[PDB]
């Protein structure tokens, strides 16, 4: 959607192309221009090898999704950031269940029949020492040899009390202390495989700056495998989280269902831009075009043409993982 191969007589299609086109007719310059595609049709092209093809002057200008990093500003010149972007962390949402099954969960279904069964068979032992007739034993078992039955039966209930607590704690802690991420610092230390997109600076920014092993970062080709690397989770060869720029991620939420949510804020907020030939005087020409293209609101009107996909779908909104005992557990 942002920039793409096309069969049309311009040759390319997208959003950044039509931002680039709508800046040309603001300039007083009749500019002849061509469009040369760069990479293969199998994966993304390496954008450090796109900007390398502007330093070596094979292309006078790289128009696309080129992101301002502090080597890329050093070797070429950029325009002003016409759109804002930041690396986020997308991850699966919290599916916290709620049921009366979640109530009776800390014992096995056979254990709820053995325990309820060995209160009546022990309750039938009271009849040996002793519908409306059967309720007479409950008036006698409120608080010889039958007292010795009550002593052992006391220490049974002082264990089924003292184990049902220990298996409702051991669910309500492991539900909290499972493999979780709520920030980029959670994702650095918890040594799970991280997905990225192929051909980006995000591969060589996490390695260079965030100190992440190269074996954790897993490349990924297209937007169908951006789901199959999260439906499988951290196991089965998939990855825990995908780290992409913000305008890529606001496409992925709408394109999929409401099962993912950006668990953090942007931890590197830079923006996009056009990559020119270094110290070319067109950069001062189109920086004045874009800052006049933005203030007239045309930079927003083009955004509704292609990137109209935006649905919030507040599954979870920075939810506090705390006590939160389930409403249907006491239904």
């Amino acid at each position: 959607d942002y920039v793409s191969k096309d069969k049309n007589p311009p040759g390319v299609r997208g959003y950044c192309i039509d931002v680039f086109e709508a800046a040309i007719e603001l300039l007083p310059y009749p500019v002849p221009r061509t469009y040369i595609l760069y990479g293969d049709g199998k994966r993304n092209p390496s954008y450090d090898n796109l900007v390398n093809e502007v330093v070596a002057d094979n292309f006078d200008v790289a128009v696309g999704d080129i992101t301002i990093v502090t080597n890329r500003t050093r070797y070429v010149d950029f325009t002003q950031p016409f759109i804002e972007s930041g690396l986020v962390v997308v991850a699966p949402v919290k599916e916290a269940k709620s049921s009366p099954w979640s109530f009776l969960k800390p014992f096995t279904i056979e254990m709820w029949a053995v325990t309820g069964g060995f209160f009546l068979f022990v309750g039938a032992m009271v009849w040996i020492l002793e519908q409306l007739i059967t309720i007479f034993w409950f008036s006698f078992s409120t608080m010889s040899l039958g007292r010795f039955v009550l002593i052992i039966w006391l220490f049974v209930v002082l264990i089924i009390n003292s184990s049902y607590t220990a298996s409702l704690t051991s669910i309500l802690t492991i539900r909290q202390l499972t493999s979780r991420i709520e920030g980029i610092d959670s994702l650095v230390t918890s040594n799970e495989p991280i997905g990225v997109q192929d051909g980006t600076f995000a591969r060589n920014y996490l390695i260079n700056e965030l100190n992440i092993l190269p074996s954790r970062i897993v490349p990924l080709k297209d937007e169908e495998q951006y789901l199959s690397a999260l439906q499988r989770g951290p196991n089965a060869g998939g990855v825990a989280a995908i780290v992409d720029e913000l305008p890529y991620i606001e496409v992925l939420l709408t394109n999929s269902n409401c099962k993912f949510r950006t668990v953090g804020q942007e931890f590197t907020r830079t923006g996009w831009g056009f990559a020119f030939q270094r110290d070319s005087p067109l950069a001062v020409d189109m920086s004045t075009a874009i800052l006049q293209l933005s203030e007239e609101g045309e930079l927003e009107k083009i955004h509704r043409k292609w990137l109209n996909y935006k649905h919030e779908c507040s599954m979870q909104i920075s939810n506090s993982e705390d006590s939160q005992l389930s409403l249907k557990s006491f239904w």
Partner: peptide, 27 residues
Amino acid sequence: GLFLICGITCFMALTVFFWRVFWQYQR
């Protein structure tokens, strides 16, 4: 294992009750 103590203690009191029934027959 905890239900084994439910079995040993309750079956002990059947024998004390049956010895009481055997002494009930002694009257």
